[PDB]
Ligand binder design. Structure first.
Ligand SMILES: Nc1ncnc2c1ncn2[C@@H]1O[C@H](COP(=O)(O)OP(=O)(O)O)[C@@H](O)[C@H]1O
Ligand SMILES: Nc1ncnc2c1ncn2[C@@H]1O[C@H](COP(=O)(O)OP(=O)(O)O)[C@@H](O)[C@H]1O
Ligand SMILES: [Mg+2]
Ligand SMILES: [Mg+2]
Lengths: 349, 349
């Protein structure tokens, strides 16, 4: 039989993955040590595993470790702080996320002889830099995952010539739109994906040729490293302590709940910080537009379709529209632009 | 008669020896024939005599037989078999290996009448069984050594009152910690010494009395024959045929090369067995602690300090930590633990 295919993303906000059979999972990039759950099972019936990932993972010692990951880790008081999370792609923090991303996206009772084309991702300026670090991790990733309170296990191990690395935004606009953007690309134009992520924002362009095929440019395209949603959480963390004036600083959930809405429910009251949320987004909108003119001279006028991506692009699509209005548009899945872009451009082999 | 002192060992993995002047040598217990080293002499400087032991050996019938021994014999393909080596202490192998480190540690400018006190060792359980045979052999010893490529020779012959017979691990914590553990030993405790050698594993304890004197317990102390580093080399060798997936097999030099590192360079590329190296070393460490507690019931609670000896325990110390944490510890010279213990406790005469 043919080899299976899974395209995941190790993005800093949330793991965004999809398989060969077009089933997708999404959960935030927070881990926590798992503790025994049969009690909270009894109060509320679990119909979603994604909310409730209690899970055991074997290792090279074949020693299991309980984990809370995803939505269940965010409610825990003892989880990862998630603002000082490592960029080391071979870390166990990245392993458990990658274990669950490969754990959910495998259906039951597959033949054990076949292997899976896994397709991961890297930052654009850190693709070459962190190429062999994930190559070492995926060669080292020999683990057996066991979902507690769902009771289905996967033996996840990969040899050589099965992993496939791509940069972020590589196949999201090269592929994934090529069947639909081919009528829009005409002659010597630039398409551009702008993925607004957690830690970084990512700019990738593709010149199409005379023969209507896109080709890459790296001096018009880079990673806005350290510029992204991370500037919004850190600013709005100070915005609460400026508005509380008590020394009360938000925890992991309260800050993440804040920048989605702007009204944290503090002491039986919503503390209004909608205006400072606009200001932190506008400074992020400042630091992507002015950096775009650093990468683009008059070639911003040489665009036919700007696309913006990322979950951070969802709340900023009309706000980051001021790059080139009436030409920029939204990618059809704002979160899953990279993953399906990894899927279609991973099936080219 | 200011008689000299040299303390040696008969370790199967390698020979460990030291003189009165604390000059110490270490070399593997591998022999081969001696062939004329004049061609390589002009190429590379034969400088380290311990690395390059081409040695001329006479007997009582003046039968000169050159031998490559040690590191150079390990480089030879036609070397001693050494993984199924005969355990006869009166072997010609042991005739060479004992006479090897003598002239390598017999100093210059000795008086005419002055002899040398030699201190040797036996396995602890076989110290009753094999006391006669080494005493047969040391009385037998009447030879003459000569060093090719370094241009000096020694006379070598001994009688009784020059011989000294203490078992393996006997004087290592009797002396060598004697005035140092005296502040640690207080009242009615045991001290732990475990020799993790190549072929054999020794366990030896000492009850200290009310009078701060160590006394020996033969029933809490035994030689674990068949347990040691020789299991790990033999385990990973079949594992090398596994991960190569071709039935190809190492040589004797690659055998000792492997489980010092675990990443053997084979057919233009590394072959990775690092997982199984962690597996087998933890597996042997499991087998030590259980057989340690085979002799140790609740008398493990009557310990105050455990030391480990042998070359294996130095690289097992993280996994041999699980006997009693922060009470178990590593001796400073894991190889020369028996040697200095043979030295000072051999200096009774
Ligand atoms: N509905 C929403 N409201 C507010 N912010 C959102 C929403 N959806 C996503 N986000 C933001 O987008 C980020 C997700 O970015 P993502 O596309 O996963 O990039 P990365 O690949 O860097 O993780 C989150 O950290 C979150 O702050
Ligand atoms: N640096 C090292 N790395 C791996 N193994 C080692 C190292 N040093 C010593 N050893 C192991 O320890 C053994 C030496 O044990 P040793 O103390 O000489 O006991 P014996 O008296 O039985 O020969 C060797 O066979 C070797 O496998
Ligand atoms: Mg992203
Ligand atoms: Mg020994």
């Amino acid at each position: 039989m043919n080899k299976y295919t899974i395209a995941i993303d190790l993005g800093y906000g949330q793991i965004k993955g999809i398989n060969q059979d077009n089933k997708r999972v999404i959960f935030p990039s927070i881990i926590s040590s798992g503790k025994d759950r049969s009690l909270d099972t009894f109060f509320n019936s679990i119909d979603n595993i994604v909310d409730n990932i209690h899970v055991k993972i074997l290792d090279e010692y074949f020693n299991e470790k309980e984990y809370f990951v995803g939505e269940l880790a965010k409610r825990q008081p003892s989880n990862s702080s998630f603002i000082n999370r490592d960029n080391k792609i071979n870390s166990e923090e990245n392993k458990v996320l990658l274990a669950t991303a490969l754990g959910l996206l495998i259906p039951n009772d597959l033949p054990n002889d076949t292997k899976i084309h896994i397709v991961t991702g890297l930052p654009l300026e850190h693709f070459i830099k962190q190429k062999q670090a994930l190559n070492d991790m995926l060669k080292d990733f020999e683990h057996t995952i066991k979902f507690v309170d769902h009771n289905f296990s996967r033996n996840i191990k990969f040899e050589e010539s099965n992993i496939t690395l791509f940069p972020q935004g590589a196949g999201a606009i090269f592929s994934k739109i090529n069947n639909d953007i081919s009528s829009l690309l005409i002659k010597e134009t630039f398409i551009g994906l702008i993925d607004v992520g957690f830690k970084t924002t990512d700019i990738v362009v593709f010149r199409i040729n005379k023969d209507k095929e896109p080709v890459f440019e790296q001096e018009m395209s880079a990673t806005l490293d350290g510029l992204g949603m991370i500037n919004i959480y850190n600013t709005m963390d100070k915005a609460f302590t400026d508005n509380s004036r008590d020394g009360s600083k938000l925890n992991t959930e309260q800050l993440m709940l804040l920048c989605e809405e702007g009204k944290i429910f503090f002491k039986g009251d919503y503390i209004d910080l909608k205006k400072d949320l606009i200001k932190a987004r506008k400074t992020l909108s400042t630091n992507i537009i002015n950096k775009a003119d650093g990468l683009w001279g008059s070639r911003k006028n040489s665009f036919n379709s700007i696309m913006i991506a990322g979950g951070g692009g969802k709340v900023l699509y009309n706000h980051l529209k001021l790059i080139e209005p009436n030409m920029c548009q939204l990618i059809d899945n704002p979160e899953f632009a990279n993953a399906i872009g990894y899927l279609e451009f991973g099936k080219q082999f």
